[PDB]
Amino acid sequence: PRYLKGWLEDVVQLSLRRPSVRASRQRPIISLNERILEFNKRNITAIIATYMRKSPWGLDVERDPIEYAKFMERYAVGLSICTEEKYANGSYETLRKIASSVSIPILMADFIVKESQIDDAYNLGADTVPLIVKILTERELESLLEYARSYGMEPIIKINDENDLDIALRIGARFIGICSRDWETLEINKENQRKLISMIPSNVVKVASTGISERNEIEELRKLGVNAFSIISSLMRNPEKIKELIEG
Numbered sequence: 001p002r003y004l005k006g007w008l009e010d011v012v013q014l015s016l017r018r019p020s021v022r023a024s025r026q027r028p029i030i031s032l033n034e035r036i037l038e039f040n041k042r043n044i045t046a047i048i049a050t051y052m053r054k055s056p057w058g059l060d061v062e063r064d065p066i067e068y069a070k071f072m073e074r075y076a077v078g079l080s081i082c083t084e085e086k087y088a089n090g091s092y093e094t095l096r097k098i099a100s101s102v103s104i105p106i107l108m109a110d111f112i113v114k115e116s117q118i119d120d121a122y123n124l125g126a127d128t129v130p131l132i133v134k135i136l137t138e139r140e141l142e143s144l145l146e147y148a149r150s151y152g153m154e155p156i157i158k159i160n161d162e163n164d165l166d167i168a169l170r171i172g173a174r175f176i177g178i179c180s181r182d183w184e185t186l187e188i189n190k191e192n193q194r195k196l197i198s199m200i201p202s203n204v205v206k207v208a209s210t211g212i213s214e215r216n217e218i219e220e221l222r223k224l225g226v227n228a229f230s231i232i233s234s235l236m237r238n239p240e241k242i243k244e245l246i247e248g
Contacts, residue, residue, distance in 0.1 A: 001016075001113050001135050001136055001137065001140065002134070002135060002136065002137055004135065004184070005184065006184065007056055007087065008135065008183055008184050010086070011084065011086060011087060011111055012111055012113055012135055014085070014086055015084075015110070015111040015112075015113045015114070015117065016113050016114060018114075018116070018117060018120075020116035020117075020119055020120055021092055021119075021120045021123055021124060022123065023096070023123040023124060024123070025122060025123055025124075025125055026100060026125060027099075027103075027125060028152075029127050029128075029151070029152045029153060030103070030104070030105045030106075030127050031105065031127065031128075031154060032048075032077070032078045032105035032106075032107060032127055032128050032154075032156075032175075033128075033154050033156075033174070033175040033205040035077055035078065035104070035105055036077055036078075036205055036207075036227050036228040037205060037227070039077050039228070040227055044077075044246065045218060045222075045229070045245065045246045046077035046227065046228035046229065047075070047076055047077060047228065047229050047230075047231055047242055047245060047246065048076060048077060048078050048079070048080050048107065048207060048228055048229065048230040048231065049072045049075070049076040049078075049079055049080070049231060049235045049239075049242055050079070050080035050081070050082060050109060050230065050231065050232045050235065050236070051065055051068055051069065051079065051080070051081045051082060051094070051098065051236070052080075052082035052088055052090065052109070052232055052236060053082070053088060053089040053090060054087065054088050054089040055087065055088060055232070055233075056087050056186060057181070057186045059232070059233050059236065061236045061237060063236070065081075065094050065097060065098055066097060066098065066101050068239060069098040069101055069102050070101060070102065071239050071240075072102075072104075072235075072239065072242065073101075073102040073103070073104050075242045075243060075246060076104060076242060077104070077105070077228055078104055078105035078106065078107060078127075078228075079098065079102065079104060079105070079106050079107070080106075080107040080109045080230065080232075081094060081095045081098055081099075081106060081107070081108060081109060081126070082109040082110065083095050083108050083109060083110040083121075084109070084110050084111060090109075090110070092120060092124055095108055095121075095124045095125070095126060096124045096125060099124055099125025099126060100125060105127045105128065106125065106126045106127050106128075107126065107127070107128050107129065107130065107156065108120075108121040108124070108126035108128070108129050109130060110129070110130075111132065111135060112129050112130065112131055112132075112144060112155075113135065113136070113140075115144065115147050117129070118144065118147055118148050118151070118153075121153075122151050122153070127153065128148075128153045128154060128155055128156060128175075129148055129153065129155050129156075130155065130156050130157075130158050130177060131144055131145060131148075131155045131156070131157050131158065132158045132183065133157065133158060133159050133160070133163075133164040133167050133168060134158075134160055134164065134183050134184070135183070138167055138170075138171070141157075141167065141168075141171050142171045142172070145157075145171060145172070145173075154174060154175050155175065156175045156176065156177045156207060157171070157173035157175065157176050157177065158176075158177045158179055159176060159177065159178055159179065159196060160178075160179045160181075160182055160183065161192065161196065162195075162196065162199070165196055165199060165200065169201070173204065174203075174204060174205065175204070175205045175207075176200060176204050176205070176206055176207070177207045177208075177209065177230065178193055178196050178197055178200075178206065178207070178208050178209065178226075179193070179209045180193045180208070180209050180210070180211070181209065188212070190217075193208060193209075194221070194224060197221065197224050197225065197226060198224060198225075200225075202225065205227050205228070206225060206226050206227045206228070207226070207227065207228045207229065207230050208221050208226045208228075208229055208230070209230045210229045210230065210231055211231060211232065211233060211234060214231070214234060214241075214245060215244070215245055217229075218245060231245075
């Protein structure tokens with residue numbers, strides 16, 4: 001990984017030490033990026049709902065992962081299951097549990113820094129992983145991306161600025177997540193996010209991290225060409241909100 005500071009450095013170093021799992025996967029990969037494109041042709045708003053117990057920006061929810069997932073299975077284009085242990089209180093077992101209970105695409109949300117965590121995602125039933133430009137070197141990014149594709153996963157390349165976008169395009173990204181929040185400091189810049197979005201080629205499947213406000217952003221960003229929307233806190237706090245966000 002790149003040299004980092006503060007919580008981000010701690011979590012990366014933790015992730016490098018993450019014990020790998022052994023399991024034999026119980027389904028073929030369901031493509032998240034392809035289901036998003038199909039939602040688009042069907043005019044169905046495509047929302048990625050995320051299960052996340054805790055976050056560095058203060059989120060703190062205890063709720064049943066399976067009931068949450070079973071509910072979300074009806075509405076979400078995919079589920080994002082946070083599997084990071086220290087800051088998110090996530091776990092691999094959780095992912096495993098959810099992956100067996102639902103038949104929609106699953107993203108394993110974690111700081112992927114080594115190949116065994118890709119092994120882990122695959123074995124536990126996840127369909128895809130994020131790859132974060134800010135934490136990985138260029139070499140690591142193209143290599144981990146090749147590695148995940150060798151399973152049949154199309155990872156989502158996470159970007160937070162123009163340089164991130166340059167790199168993601170240069171490595172052959174086809175599935176990009178535009179973050180509003182900076183990973184290092186936890187600051188949100190919706191303007192910069194809109195700016196990045198207008199710079200992405202049309203044939204790239206685009207997910208914007210969205211939250212504060214919602215609905216308004218969804219119509220606006222969708223017009224900017226965004227394909228799907230990743231939402232965390234508001235849906236952890238009130239799952240039935242996804243219904244409203246998809247419909248009028």
